Design an enzyme around this catalytic site. Structure first.
Site, PDB file in Angstrom:
ATOM      1  N   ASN A 101     -40.373  48.469  13.723  1.00  0.00           N
ATOM      2  CA  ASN A 101     -39.457  49.387  14.367  1.00  0.00           C
ATOM      3  C   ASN A 101     -38.180  49.585  13.546  1.00  0.00           C
ATOM      4  O   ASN A 101     -37.708  48.663  12.866  1.00  0.00           O
ATOM      5  CB  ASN A 101     -39.150  48.966  15.802  1.00  0.00           C
ATOM      6  N   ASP A 106     -41.598  53.356  15.438  1.00  0.00           N
ATOM      7  CA  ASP A 106     -42.434  52.304  14.915  1.00  0.00           C
ATOM      8  C   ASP A 106     -43.324  52.861  13.798  1.00  0.00           C
ATOM      9  O   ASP A 106     -43.861  53.973  13.918  1.00  0.00           O
ATOM     10  CB  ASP A 106     -43.352  51.731  15.987  1.00  0.00           C
ATOM     11  N   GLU A 138     -51.824  48.412  17.682  1.00  0.00           N
ATOM     12  CA  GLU A 138     -50.629  49.114  17.249  1.00  0.00           C
ATOM     13  C   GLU A 138     -50.978  50.444  16.570  1.00  0.00           C
ATOM     14  O   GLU A 138     -50.227  51.414  16.701  1.00  0.00           O
ATOM     15  CB  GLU A 138     -49.787  48.214  16.346  1.00  0.00           C
ATOM     16  N   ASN A 194     -40.192  55.240  20.109  1.00  0.00           N
ATOM     17  CA  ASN A 194     -39.914  54.304  21.175  1.00  0.00           C
ATOM     18  C   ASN A 194     -38.983  55.030  22.148  1.00  0.00           C
ATOM     19  O   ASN A 194     -38.259  55.931  21.742  1.00  0.00           O
ATOM     20  CB  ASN A 194     -39.310  53.010  20.603  1.00  0.00           C
ATOM     21  N   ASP A 202     -36.226  53.987  23.086  1.00  0.00           N
ATOM     22  CA  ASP A 202     -34.826  53.751  22.778  1.00  0.00           C
ATOM     23  C   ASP A 202     -34.323  54.683  21.675  1.00  0.00           C
ATOM     24  O   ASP A 202     -33.166  54.573  21.266  1.00  0.00           O
ATOM     25  CB  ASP A 202     -34.568  52.283  22.460  1.00  0.00           C
ATOM     26  N   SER A 242     -35.767  54.751  18.647  1.00  0.00           N
ATOM     27  CA  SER A 242     -36.222  54.213  17.383  1.00  0.00           C
ATOM     28  C   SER A 242     -37.675  54.619  17.217  1.00  0.00           C
ATOM     29  O   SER A 242     -38.235  55.210  18.114  1.00  0.00           O
ATOM     30  CB  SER A 242     -36.034  52.743  17.307  1.00  0.00           C
TER      31      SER A 242
END
Ligand SMILES: [Cl-]
Ligand SMILES: [Cl-]
Ligand SMILES: [Cl-]
Ligand SMILES: [Cl-]
Ligand SMILES: [Cl-]
Ligand SMILES: [Cl-]
Ligand SMILES: [Cl-]
Ligand SMILES: [Cl-]
Ligand SMILES: [Cl-]
Ligand SMILES: [Cl-]
Ligand code: NA
Ligand code: NA
Length: 129
Positions: A59, A52, A35, A46, A48, A50
């Protein structure tokens, strides 16, 4: 802060993640590696919209508030910026709620794709734990 591998394993163990919901410590270290590369300050967008945040890439759609993610929630009740601290407490505590959410560590796509089904004990090999 960029954690060393065994430093992070020690801190995660101290915070009660070893075998938390049945996930051995090496699973958590593996997830962190892919990660964030053990870097608390990691941020990634992300698809979408959003973002992280932090060592475990939590998120802003569900878990933390960053003030820019529409129709999102803040189920850990924390600013996303607090996930970037050199102190992993807020990250660990929020991760304990995510892993308890029903899908276990599959909530982390990188865990599913890179750690699951592999020899995750390798990630804590050599560590004085
Ligand atoms: Cl280390
Ligand atoms: Cl490493
Ligand atoms: Cl610690
Ligand atoms: Cl392990
Ligand atoms: Cl805000
Ligand atoms: Cl922006
Ligand atoms: Cl928001
Ligand atoms: Cl909420
Ligand atoms: Cl810490
Ligand atoms: Cl599970
Ligand atoms: Na990621
Ligand atoms: Na949010």
């Amino acid at each position: 802060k960029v954690f060393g591998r065994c430093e992070l394993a020690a801190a995660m163990k101290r915070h009660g993640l070893d075998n938390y919901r049945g996930y051995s410590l090496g699973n958590w270290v593996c997830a962190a590696k892919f990660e964030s590369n053990f870097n608390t300050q990691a941020t990634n967008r992300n698809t979408d919209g959003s973002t992280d945040y932090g060592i475990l890439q939590i998120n802003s759609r569900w878990w933390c508030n960053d003030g820019r993610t529409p129709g999102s929630r803040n189920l850990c009740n924390i600013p996303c910026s607090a996930l970037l601290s050199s102190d992993i407490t807020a990250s660990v505590n929020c991760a304990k709620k995510i892993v308890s959410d029903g899908n276990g560590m599959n909530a982390w796509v990188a865990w599913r794709n890179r750690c699951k089904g592999t020899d995750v004990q390798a990630w804590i090999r050599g560590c004085r734990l």
